[PDB]
Amino acid sequence: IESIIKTATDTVKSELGVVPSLNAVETGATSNTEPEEAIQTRTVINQHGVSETLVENFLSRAALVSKRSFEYKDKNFFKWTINTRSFVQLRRKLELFTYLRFDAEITILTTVAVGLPDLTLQAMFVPTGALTPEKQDSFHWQSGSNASVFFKISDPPARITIPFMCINSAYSVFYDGFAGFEKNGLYGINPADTIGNLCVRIVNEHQPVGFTVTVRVYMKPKHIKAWAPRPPRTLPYMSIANANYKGKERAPNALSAIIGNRDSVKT
Amino acid sequence: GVPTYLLPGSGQFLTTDDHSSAPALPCFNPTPEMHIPGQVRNMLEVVQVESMMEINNTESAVGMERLKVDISALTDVDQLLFNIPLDIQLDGPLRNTLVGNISRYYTHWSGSLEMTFMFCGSFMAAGKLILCYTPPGGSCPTTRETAMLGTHIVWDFGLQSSVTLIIPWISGSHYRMFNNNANVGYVTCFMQTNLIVPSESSDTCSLIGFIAAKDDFSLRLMRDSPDIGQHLHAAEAAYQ
Amino acid sequence: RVLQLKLGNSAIVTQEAANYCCAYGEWPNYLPDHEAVAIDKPTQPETATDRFYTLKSVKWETGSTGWWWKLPDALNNIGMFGQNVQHHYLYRSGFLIHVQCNATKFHQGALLVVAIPEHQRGAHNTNTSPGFDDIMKGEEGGTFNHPYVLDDGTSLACATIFPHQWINLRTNNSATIVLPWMNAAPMDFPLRHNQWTLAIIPVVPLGTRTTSSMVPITVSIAPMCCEFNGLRH
Amino acid sequence: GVPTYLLPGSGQFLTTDDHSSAPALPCFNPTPEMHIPGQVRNMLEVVQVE
């Protein structure tokens, strides 16, 4: 029975020598013996809002998902395949769910390292199933179908919302299965779940500049739905593709011992 | 010709904002939703669920042995079997739980916990235990005769394979603060009697305890998790 | 309180256990008309495949790490289910797993019968992805190599978030999990994708005074609400 | 496409302004108020006292 729960639940008061009956964990049931029943309580009107634990609020933060510097005088630009698996902070927070449905939201933020020049950038989103530019100046950059976006450096950062791209109803975060239909296709990759390929170049023709452009791509996913939560991954990662596990040499977060030790259980 | 002017904080990128941005693909018809079972609409639905405690988080316990506490016949009457500190901030038995690992994304937490201890001996194996709940502030008891006072529950094996135990939310403040602490509480367990197995059952019975948050649980002021964070294979392969 | 699940021509003598687990609170049903994709009329066997495929009994000794079966990878050869899996382009089927363990009143032990959706396994210590003959096992069904982390770097201590039961050899001797169609797609490929993973891990190992103690675990999967599209041959 | 134009005094920081700014913590549930005695709602309440 679903019910709107805007605040955390209230506590009714409680009442000598009462005799409660029984319990069962082994059916798979979390025990719902109330704090009213097991111990003495009092009336608490509870006003703690549950809103910040919502699955929207838990994931709709603009995490930096890429930080790629390129030198201007791939070389001369960068193309980046979209995954949230880049940085381990956001991925573990997304490995808490099996199926995720969200609309992404890219915010490209550009700086210039070493009179600092003003340039115009192009951030073309090439979804998978199209052609990404190999060279800096292919004819793929003026492809009028791909949702390109032009933006300067000295202006607020460019920002575009990319919709839910998958042909399934949700991105399979984990994927117990194999891509394609042949036996050399890799494990844990769904071809359906690929977002696209965002690629950013500097539009200007070649300037005598001794300057480095550091580009940061942010992603605040929104309109988020989630399904089938998972145990959070405790061990350190070993790659972006597969969920291999190594463990550390000492506790905590080791293979033999996830929790750091103490003297004894009774000390 | 609307007369406008820019406020301070114009043109900033606030990485927690919420503003309707420009769509990339116009009139993109998204793939229609389909009722997938088990939709999480709030993370307290996950925290509500039981999960195991590593009560044996010591050395000389390896892997699956770190989850269960073995009651032998060598453990005498009125011996302390274990104590579980209720510091979910501290890296002890409550961290590798659903209630622990989701709370560590959150600085401030409230609400009540709930332990449940399942006995995994033989059927014929009978004997008593006393689970006493120390409140915050009070120190861990060392004897049954002290554990008989506070909030104990005398539990028998042959009669009852599991005991629900409520950790009530007691605090002067509306929340607690996760440090970057001192006795949120304790649950201890003493051998009220011996362990009695017949001459064929194994003389080393085992317990496993759980913990779940109750319905009053609440979390706020989202931080990043202390656990994860750092080589990453094929990390540069997205670019190349 | 002895019982007899009669489903199809197959039948199992069971114990009446309380609270037969409907995973995520849902009994499995057929694909609704407003969510379908394949325009052709799917074949719906009602007693050919809907029957208790009971796998081999597995010897739980006092040192076992666990057993894992992937669905429908375990059933890709067995019976009329394997005569449709290997004759259709798609399938859609919930499952009804009855795991029964046969102990005395003297054996101690505890099992975690848990059904992990999309259990993307991991290979320990190597950056090579797990091979095709390391995931698909069939009627044999693999064995956990590091069950404490569920062979994927997650935690077994948190693994009760999945649809789980318990075989505590004091209390009960059988588990029952009823599975809905958990997938992001209405139908999927019956040789390329495993939705669930029946994981049975001994939390507390087996024990009695004879230290050569072995107890067999019986596992029986029945597919509920089968559907198939794209009939070749 | 609203036709706007900037006034003079655009982009200034006036240290006595009163404008609704961007929140740092979104959907932050603040700690609920609790009736503490002796609330000063105007400083002439203090000046009134001997």
Binding site: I1, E2, S3, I4, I5, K6, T27, G28, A29, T30, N32, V50, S51, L54, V55, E56, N57, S60, D103, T161, P163, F164, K222, H223, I224 | D18, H19, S20, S21, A22, P23, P26, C27, F28, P30, G38, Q39, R41, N42, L44, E45, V46, Q48, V49, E50, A212, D215 | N19, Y20, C21, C22, A23, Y24, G25, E26, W27, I161, P163, V178 | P26
Partner: peptide, 28 residues
């Protein structure tokens, strides 16, 4: 939202409809 598309809008932080029972009590 002044964009024609619907996913272009701001986030919808209004889905307060819990159901904790479907994990704690997935039984029949």
């Amino acid at each position: 939202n002044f964009y024609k598309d619907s996913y272009a809008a701001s986030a919808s932080k209004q889905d307060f409809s819990q159901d904790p029972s479907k994990f704690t009590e997935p039984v029949v």
